[PDB]
Amino acid sequence: LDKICLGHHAVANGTIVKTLTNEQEEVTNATETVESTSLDRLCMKGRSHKDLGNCHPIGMLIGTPACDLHLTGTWDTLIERENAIAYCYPGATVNEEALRQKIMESGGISKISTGFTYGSSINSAGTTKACMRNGGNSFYAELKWLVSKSKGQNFPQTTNTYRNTDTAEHLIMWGIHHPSSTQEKNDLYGTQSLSISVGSSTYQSNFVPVVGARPQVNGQSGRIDFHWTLVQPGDNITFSHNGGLIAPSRVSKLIGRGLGIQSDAPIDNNCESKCFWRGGSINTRLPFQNLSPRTVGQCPKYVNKKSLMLATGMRNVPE
Amino acid sequence: DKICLGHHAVANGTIVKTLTNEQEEVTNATETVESTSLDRLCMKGRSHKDLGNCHPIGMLIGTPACDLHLTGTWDTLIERENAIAYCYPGATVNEEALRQKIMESGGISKISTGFTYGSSINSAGTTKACMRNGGNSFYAELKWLVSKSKGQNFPQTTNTYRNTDTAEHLIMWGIHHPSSTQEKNDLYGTQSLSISVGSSTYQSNFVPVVGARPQVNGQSGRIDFHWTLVQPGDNITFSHNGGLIAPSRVSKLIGRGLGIQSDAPIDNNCESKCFWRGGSINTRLPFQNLSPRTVGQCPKYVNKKSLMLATGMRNVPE
Amino acid sequence: LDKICLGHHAVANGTIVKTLTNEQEEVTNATETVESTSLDRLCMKGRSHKDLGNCHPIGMLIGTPACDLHLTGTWDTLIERENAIAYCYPGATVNEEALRQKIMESGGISKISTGFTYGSSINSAGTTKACMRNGGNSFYAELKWLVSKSKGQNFPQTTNTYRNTDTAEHLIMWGIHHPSSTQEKNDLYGTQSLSISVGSSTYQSNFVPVVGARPQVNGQSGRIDFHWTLVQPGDNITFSHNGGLIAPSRVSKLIGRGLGIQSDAPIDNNCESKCFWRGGSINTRLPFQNLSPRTVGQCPKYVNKKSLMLATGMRNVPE
Amino acid sequence: GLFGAIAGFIENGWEGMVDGWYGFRHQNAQGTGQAADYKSTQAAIDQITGKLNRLIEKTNTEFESIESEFSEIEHQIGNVINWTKDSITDIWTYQAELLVAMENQHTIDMADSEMLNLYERVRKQLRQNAEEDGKGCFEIYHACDDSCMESIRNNTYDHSQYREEALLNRLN
Amino acid sequence: GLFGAIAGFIENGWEGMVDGWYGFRHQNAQGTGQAADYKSTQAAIDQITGKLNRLIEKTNTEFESIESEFSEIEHQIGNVINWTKDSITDIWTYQAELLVAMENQHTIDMADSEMLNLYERVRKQLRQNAEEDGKGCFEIYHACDDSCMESIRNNTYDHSQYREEALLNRLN
Amino acid sequence: GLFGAIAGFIENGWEGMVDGWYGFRHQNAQGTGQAADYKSTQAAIDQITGKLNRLIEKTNTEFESIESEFSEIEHQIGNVINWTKDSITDIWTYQAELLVAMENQHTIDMADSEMLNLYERVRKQLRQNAEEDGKGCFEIYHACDDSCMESIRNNTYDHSQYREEALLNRLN
Ligand SMILES: *[C@@H]1O[C@H](CO)[C@@H](O[C@@H]2O[C@H](CO)[C@@H](O[C@@H]3O[C@H](CO[C@@H]4O[C@H](CO)[C@@H](O)[C@H](O)[C@@H]4O)[C@@H](O)[C@H](O[C@H]4O[C@H](CO)[C@@H](O)[C@H](O)[C@@H]4O)[C@@H]3O)[C@H](O)[C@H]2NC(C)=O)[C@H](O)[C@H]1NC(C)=O
Ligand SMILES: *[C@@H]1O[C@H](CO)[C@@H](O[C@@H]2O[C@H](CO)[C@@H](O[C@@H]3O[C@H](CO[C@H]4O[C@H](CO)[C@@H](O)[C@H](O)[C@@H]4O)[C@@H](O)[C@H](O[C@H]4O[C@H](CO)[C@@H](O)[C@H](O)[C@@H]4O)[C@@H]3O)[C@H](O)[C@H]2NC(C)=O)[C@H](O)[C@H]1NC(C)=O
Ligand SMILES: *[C@@H]1O[C@H](CO)[C@@H](O[C@@H]2O[C@H](CO)[C@@H](O[C@@H]3O[C@H](CO[C@H]4O[C@H](CO)[C@@H](O)[C@H](O)[C@@H]4O)[C@@H](O)[C@H](O[C@H]4O[C@H](CO)[C@@H](O)[C@H](O)[C@@H]4O)[C@@H]3O)[C@H](O)[C@H]2NC(C)=O)[C@H](O)[C@H]1NC(C)=O
Ligand SMILES: *[C@@H]1O[C@H](CO)[C@@H](O[C@@H]2O[C@H](CO)[C@@H](O[C@@H]3O[C@H](CO)[C@@H](O)[C@H](O)[C@@H]3O)[C@H](O)[C@H]2NC(C)=O)[C@H](O)[C@H]1NC(C)=O
Ligand SMILES: *[C@@H]1O[C@H](CO)[C@@H](O[C@H]2O[C@H](CO)[C@@H](O)[C@H](O)[C@H]2NC(C)=O)[C@H](O)[C@H]1NC(C)=O
Ligand SMILES: *[C@@H]1O[C@H](CO)[C@@H](O)[C@H](O)[C@H]1NC(C)=O
Ligand SMILES: *[C@@H]1O[C@H](CO)[C@@H](O)[C@H](O)[C@H]1NC(C)=O
Ligand SMILES: *[C@@H]1O[C@H](CO)[C@@H](O)[C@H](O)[C@H]1NC(C)=O
Ligand SMILES: *[C@H]1O[C@H](CO)[C@@H](O)[C@H](O)[C@H]1NC(C)=O
Ligand SMILES: *[C@H]1O[C@H](CO)[C@@H](O)[C@H](O)[C@H]1NC(C)=O
Ligand SMILES: *[C@H]1O[C@H](CO)[C@@H](O)[C@H](O)[C@H]1NC(C)=O
C-alpha cells in the first residue's frame, strides 16, 4: 500500500548538553556560552591611553624621576605595571590605596604652582643620591626638602599658604621627613622640638618627625612619608612648620574620568576591547567567562565553570 | 453547514519581548518598571522629625540650629542638604559612622554628666560663632573649660561619668586646637597640654595642634569631636589640664528609625515605604528605574526604561 | 459495548504547592527545599581542630595565661568562644579585628625567639597581679615589661633589633605602657621624658607613655595598648627606647590555611559538616536554608522563607 | 506557536469578537453567527490574573542608606560600595528581563493551548458526524440549523441523533 | 492544563490505582479490569528523579566570616556588610521561589503530556476499530476479550484482524 | 518527550537528510523519494537564532577595580571584598547553569512541537483518503504519483480530487 512518512534529521555522534531533568541529553548541535580564551595583549584601539611603564601612579603627583614623562597629561585609559616606582627616597603614603584608585579613576592631571618662597635662613634646594636625574642628585620634582641653611641652627618658624583660585578642587601633597638619628635631625633642623601643622577650611592635622635607627632602603635609613588632601575652590591651605616639612612646589588637579588597568600584557593599538584583566583583554560576545574574577570595563560575568553548552538543534536520535 | 473556532484580536497590538523574539505582538500587556515618583515625602502613618537646618551630629553636641532637636522620639528622621553641625568650626572623627548611627535610631535621650569644676576654671566659655538669643553662646551639651584668669595654668583635673543605666550611653567630647600660641596661653596657660580618656572598653590620649589656618565662621581655631560608648555599670574618666571640651550631657539612642536624606516637601496625606532624594516611590510594581539610591521597602532598581509583560494572547489581525 | 479507558492515579489528601499561576495547586506528592533544622553541635569529624576555650586568638600571639596551651600548634579549624580573654593586664590592640581574622584564616602558629637582651639596670621581668600564673604574679609569655632595676632611676636609652632570617614573613607585636599616675611613671622609668621609636624597612612610628587615671580593670588603672606589623623575609626591625616599651621575646609565623568558627556549641567528633554557624552545624543536602544569614564553610544559601515545596507528582484530582 | 493553533491552523484572529478571547463562527441557511466561549476565555484569564498577583508582592526587606546624599564618602569604601551596588543592579536587571521574556512566552503558549483544547473538545463532541477543514473549522455532514449550532456551543449536542444521517452523507 | 488531559478531557483520577501513575480500565464480556502501564509511569518518575538530583548539587564555595559574633564591628563597615548581605538574601529568596514555582508548573505539565502521549498511542493502534468517548475512553466496535485487551495494553493489538467486523458495527 | 513525536512515536531520525530539519519520505509505483520541508525547518531555526541573538546582548555596565594586583589590600576590607565577590560569583554561576538547562529543554520541546505541527498539517490535508500507521506515516488508499506526492508537500493536495476512490479502497 502507498505511503508518505514524516521525520527529522539526525547526525552520527551528537553533542551532549544538560537539561533540567537530564545530565546527559544528546542533541544534533550546540554552542559554548563560557569564554575560556583571552588575548594576551591590551587592546587599545580607539583609546587615548597612557602606559606608565616604570612609573607608579602616586609618583606622577610627587614627581619621582621614573615619572618625568607622566607629570601632566590626558587619557581615557591608564595602565599600571608591576613593580613601578613611587618612592626613590624610601617612604610611604598615608591612605595610599585610596589615592592610587583616585588617580586610576581619572582622565588627566594638571599641575599648578604653589608659589612658596623661603627666607635665606631656609635652604630649599637640597637633593639626594637616592633620587637621580641626568647622572646627578635630585629630588621629587614637585616638592622641596627644606632644611636650615646654616647647619645645627633651629629651623625658623615658617608659614606658607597656597590658595586655590580655580573653580575645581586641587589635590595637595606633602612629605614629612623622619630622620634616622638624633644628630642627623639636629644637623638639618636644630635641637628644638619639631612640629608641622596643616590647616584648610575642611582639614587640619599635626605631624612630628619620628627619629630612630632603622634599615637602609635604597641606601637611606631616613624616610619621608607623604600626606594628601583636597583643597576646594576658593579655599586656602596653610602650612606652619619649624622643621621636617617637604613642601609642595606644585599641586595637582585630576581631570575627567578614565579606566585604570593593572597588567603586564603588551599594548596592541590595532584591536579594541572593553574588558581587561591582569592577563590581557577579553573580546567575546559570550555572556560568561571563566578567565578571572578580577576584570575591569564592560565584561562578561565570571562563572565557576569550564563549559556550558547551549543546544542549537533538536534531540539527536541516530539510526 | 460549517462551524469554525477562533480567537479574538485587536487592530493596534502591543510589542513585547520573548525568549525567541524581540518584536512579539500581543493583544495586551502592562508595565513592570516604575518610572514615576511623587516629588514629596509621604509621611502619613509616621512619627517623623524634620531636622530642617539641623545636622544629626549637631543634635548630640547641641548646635544652636539643633535647639529643637536635642531630644525626642520618631520612627522616621529627615535630613536636609546644608544642615549645620558645627557652629564653631571643626570635625568629628568617624563622622559618617556617627551620622548613620543617629539616622538608624528612633529617638534620643539626654542624661547629665554631673561634672563640676574648681573655681580657677571658667566653664561658661562662649563664642560669637555660636549665637543663641543673639548672645555669644556654645554647644548646649558641652562646656568650653578655660582658666578664669587669663594666662593661668589650667589645673590638673579629673571627671568621671558613671553609667548607672541599663543601656549603653553615647558620650562625646571635644579637643580645642587654637590658631596661635597666645590664644593657647590666654585660655589654658603655658604648660604642655595632655588630655586622657579611658573606660574599661576604651582608651585614648589627645594633644592640641596649634597652627594658623583660614577662618571659618569668623574663627581660625578648631574644635574636633570624639565619641565612644559607655557600657552599663561602666565608668569613663577624663584627666585633662587644658583644651578639653567636656560634656555636660551624654546621649542615649532609642529604638529604630528609618533615616532619609531629601529636600522634597513633607506631606501627611500620602503613605509610602520607599524613599529617595527626589521623594517617595509608591508602586505596586516590582521594579524601578528612578534611582539606585533608595531607602525603605522598595522595588529593585533596574537599568531599563520599560519591561512590558504580556496580559493577552499573540495578536494576529485580519 | 466493550470499552477501554485511560487514566492516571490520585490520592485522597494531596499537597499544596506554588506554581507560576496559582498559589494553591494540589499535587500527589512534594518535598522540602529549605532546611529549617540545625544540629546544636560543632561537627568536627575529619578535621584537625583547636578549641580555644577561654583563650582569645590575639592572646595566642602575646601569650596571656588563658592561652598558655595555644601558643603554638597546627589545625585546619580553629574555634573561638564567647568571652575569651586576650588581655590580662588591660589594654587594646590597634586594628584588632583585622588581626583576629588573620589568625582565624590561619592553619597554625610557630614561635621564633627574638634574642633580645638587656643591660644590668633593666629589670626585664616586671610581673603583675592581673596576669596570674600558678597563683602568684606573672606576665604575657611572649613579651617583656622593662623597668629600671632601681625604683626612681632614669631608665636607660636602649636599642634592640629583630632580624628575620627565614623565607616567610613574621608577625611582630609589642606594647606601650601608659602609667596610671606620674609617680608610677617615675617609679618604673624615672623622671625624663620617654620616647619609643620603632622602625623596620616597611614601618615606623613613635609612641609616648601618657600618664592618666583610668577605671580599674583586673585591679589595674594603667593600660598597655598593643601594636603589630609584618616583618618580611630578609628584613630587620629596630626598637629604640628609654621607658614604656613592652618588648617581644618571640614573634609568630602563621602557617597555612584554616576555617575560623565563632560558636559556643559543643564539639562532636562523630559527625561531619562543611557548614557552621553560631548555633552549631548544618548538613543538609537541601540547597536553601532559613537558620541564619551568618554561616561559614560551604553552605546552602540563606533565604527568607519558612517553606518551599517542590512537586514530586502530578496534579491531584480526587473523586 | 507551540500548540499549532493560534498563528497556526487558524489563519487570523477575529477583531469582531469584543466579548471574549475564544469562540465560534458558523455558516448555515439561516446565516452567520459569532459567539464567545465562556470557559475557555475564563481559563486563560484566571492564569494571567495568577501571574499578575504573583508579581506585585515584593520584598518586605527594609534597606538603610549606605551613601550620604549630602556629604562625601571616603574614596576606597565609596568604590567598594559602587562596585557592589552596580553588580546587584546588573543581577536584577538581568532577572527582570528574563522573568518578563519567560512569562511572555508562557502566556502566549498557554493561550495557544486553550484554543486547541476547545477545538479538541468540540472535535470529540461531533464524533463521526463531521470532518476537519485544516483551517480550524468542522464541515458537518447533516443539516445543522441555528438550534443545532447552539447545542454544539453549549455542550449539549448528541452525536447519535444526527449520526446515521451524517454517515449517509459522508459516503455520497 | 496545557495538554488538556489531566483535569482536562479526563474528568478525574483513580485512587484505586496504586501499582502505578498511568494505566487502563476496561469492560468486555468477562467483566472489568484495572492495570498500570510501565513505560509512561517510569518516564515520568525518571524525569522527577532527574530534577531532584539537580536540586542537591553541592556549591563548594568556601566562605569565611566577615562579622564577629562576640565583638562589635565598626558601625560604617557593619552597615555596608548588612546592606550587602540583605541584598544577597533578597536575590536568593527570589530565585528560590521562582525556581520552585517554575519546576512545579513544568512537572504538572510534563505529567499532563505523558497522559496524552499514551492516549494518542492507544488511539493509533485502534485505527478504524474504535471511536473516542471524549472522556478518555475508547468504544470498541467489535468484541474484545481479556487477551484482546492485554494485546492493546502491551502494544500487541493488530487492527487488521478485527477491522471488517468493526466496520460492520460502526455503520450497521 | 513533551509533544510525543521526536524520540516518540517517530522511532528515529534520518541521517540522510542534510538539506533540512524536518521532511518526507514517500513510496509509490515509481519508487522512492525524500525531501525536506522548508517552512517547518525555518520555524525551528528562526527560534534558535532569536535565542542566540538574545544571549550575546550586552550589559553596558562599566566596573572599576576594587582590588590591587600589584600591592596588598588592608586585611579586613580585603575579606569583605572577597566575601562579596564570591557571593556574586555563586549567583552568576547558578544563573548561567539554570539559563542554559532551561533553554536546552525548551529548544528540544519546541523542535518536537514543529515535528508534530507538520504531521498534523498533513493529516488534515489528506482527510479521509489515508490512515495512520502509528510510526509517523499515512498509508494512502489511492494512487498517488510523484506529482501528487509533490502536491501534498507543496500543500496543494485536494482530497476531493481523490476521495470517492479512496473511500472505495478503505471500505472495499
Ligand atoms: C547589622 O545587622 C545586625 C543584625 O540584624 C545588627 O545586630 C542586631 O541589632 C542589635 C546589635 O547592636 C541587637 O539589638 C538588640 O538585641 C537584644 C538582644 O538580646 C537578646 O538576644 C536574643 C536575640 O538576639 C534573645 O534571645 C533575647 O531577646 C536576648 O535578650 C534585644 O533584646 C534588643 O531589643 C530591645 O532593646 C531596646 C533597648 O535598646 C528595648 O528598649 C526594646 O524593648 C527592644 O526590644 C535589641 O533587639 C540585636 O540583638 C542584633 N542582632 C544580631 C543578630 O546581631 C547590627 O546592629 C547591624 N549593624 C549596623 C551597623 O547597623
Ligand atoms: C560611586 O558612584 C557615584 C555615582 O556615580 C559617584 O558620584 C558621581 O560622580 C561623578 C563624578 O565622577 C559626578 O558627575 C559630576 O556631575 C557634575 C554635574 O553636577 C551634578 O551634581 C549632582 C550631585 O551633586 C548630580 O547628581 C547632578 O546630576 C548634577 O548635574 C559634573 O559637572 C562633574 O564633573 C564634570 O567636570 C567637567 C567640568 O569642567 C565636565 O566636562 C565633565 O563632563 C564632568 O562631568 C561630574 O560629571 C556625579 O555628580 C556623582 N553622582 C552622584 C550621584 O554623586 C561616586 O563618585 C562613585 N565614587 C567613586 C568612583 O569614588
Ligand atoms: C582574598 O582572596 C584572594 C584570592 O584568593 C587571596 O589571595 C591569595 O592568597 C593566597 C594565600 O592564602 C595566595 O596563595 C599562596 O601563593 C603561593 C603561590 O604564589 C603565587 O604568587 C602570585 C602572586 O604574586 C599568585 O598570583 C600566583 O598564582 C602564584 O601561584 C603558594 O606558595 C601558597 O601556598 C603555600 O603557602 C605556604 C607558605 O605560607 C607554603 O609553606 C605551602 O607549601 C603552601 O603550598 C599559596 O597558594 C594566592 O596567591 C593569593 N591570590 C591572589 C590572587 O592574590 C587574598 O589573600 C584574600 N584576602 C584576604 C584578606 O584574606
Ligand atoms: C583665602 O585667602 C584669600 C586671600 O587672602 C581670602 O580672600 C579675601 O577675602 C576678603 C573677605 O573675604 C576680601 O577683603 C575685602 O575686599 C577688599 C579688598 O581690598 C577690602 O577693601 C574690604 O574691606 C574687604 O576686606 C578680599 O577679597 C580677600 N583679601 C585678601 C587680603 O586677599 C579668603 O578670605 C581666604 N579664605 C577663604 C576663601 O576661605
Ligand atoms: C638585616 O641585618 C643584617 C645583619 O647585619 C644585614 O646584613 C646582613 O645581610 C647582608 C645581605 O646583603 C650581608 O651581606 C651582610 O654581611 C649581613 N651581615 C651580617 C649577617 O652580619 C641585612 O642586610 C639587613 N637587612 C636589611 C633589609 O637591612
Ligand atoms: C565604676 O564606677 C564606680 C566609681 O567610678 C566604681 O565604684 C565601680 O566599681 C566601677 N564599676 C565598674 C564596672 O568599673
Ligand atoms: C445550555 O446547557 C446548559 C448546561 O450545559 C444549561 O444549564 C442551559 O439551560 C442550556 N441553555 C440552552 C439555551 O439550551
Ligand atoms: C505544487 O507542486 C506541483 C508538483 O507537480 C506543481 O505541478 C504545481 O504547479 C504546484 N502548485 C502550485 C499552485 O504552485
Ligand atoms: C552548529 O553547527 C551546525 C553544523 O552542523 C550548524 O547548523 C550551525 O551553524 C552551528 N551552530 C552555530 C551557532 O553556528
Ligand atoms: C490591558 O488593556 C486591555 C484593554 O484596555 C484590557 O483588556 C485589560 O484589562 C488591560 N490589562 C489590565 C491589567 O488592566
Ligand atoms: C514523596 O512521598 C511519597 C510517599 O508519601 C514517596 O513515595 C516519595 O519517595 C516521596 N518523595 C520525597 C519526599 O522526595
Side-chain angles (χ1 to χ4, degrees), chain F residues 126-139:
Chain F
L126 292 182
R127 190 149 166 183
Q128 296 303 263
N129 303 357
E131 290 173 26
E132 307 174 78
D133 69 349
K135 295 178 286 194
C137 318
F138 301 86
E139 293 179 14

Side-chain angles (χ1 to χ4, degrees), chain F residues 32-54 56-84:
Chain F
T32 290
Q34 194 193 235
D37 183 283
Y38 182 80
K39 187 173 174 181
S40 67
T41 295
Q42 286 294 337
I45 287 172
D46 291 6
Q47 288 178 108
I48 297 292
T49 320
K51 276 176 201 283
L52 291 181
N53 288 345
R54 213 179 95 260
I56 59 175
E57 84 176 33
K58 314 224 201 231
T59 110
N60 49 295
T61 309
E62 175 114 346
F63 286 88
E64 319 171 355
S65 160
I66 53 168
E67 290 192 81
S68 178
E69 299 271 358
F70 302 134
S71 69
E72 220 158 73
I73 340 322
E74 190 276 312
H75 202 104
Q76 198 179 357
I77 202 70
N79 279 338
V80 171
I81 288 157
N82 284 359
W83 189 98
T84 307

Side-chain angles (χ1 to χ4, degrees), chain F residues 147 151 154 156:
Chain F
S147 206
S151 73
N154 201 1
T156 65

Side-chain angles (χ1 to χ4, degrees), chain C residues 177-192:
Chain C
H177 187 226
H178 306 295
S180 66
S181 79
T182 60
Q183 202 191 60
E184 258 214 309
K185 185 289 206 162
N186 297 341
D187 282 346
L188 285 4
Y189 322 115
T191 68
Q192 65 247 355

Side-chain angles (χ1 to χ4, degrees), chain A residues 163 201 234-236, chain B residues 214-215:
Chain A
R163 309 180 220 257
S201 306
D235 203 15
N236 319 306
Chain B
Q215 283 195 333

Side-chain angles (χ1 to χ4, degrees), chain C residues 120-131:
Chain C
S120 48
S121 72
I122 291 169
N123 174 353
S124 61
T127 63
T128 165
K129 172 192 310 205
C131 310

Side-chain angles (χ1 to χ4, degrees), chain C residues 5-20:
Chain C
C5 297
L6 287 173
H8 60 271
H9 83 322
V11 302
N13 46 66
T15 318
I16 305 310
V17 294
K18 315 208 153 164
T19 70
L20 270 12

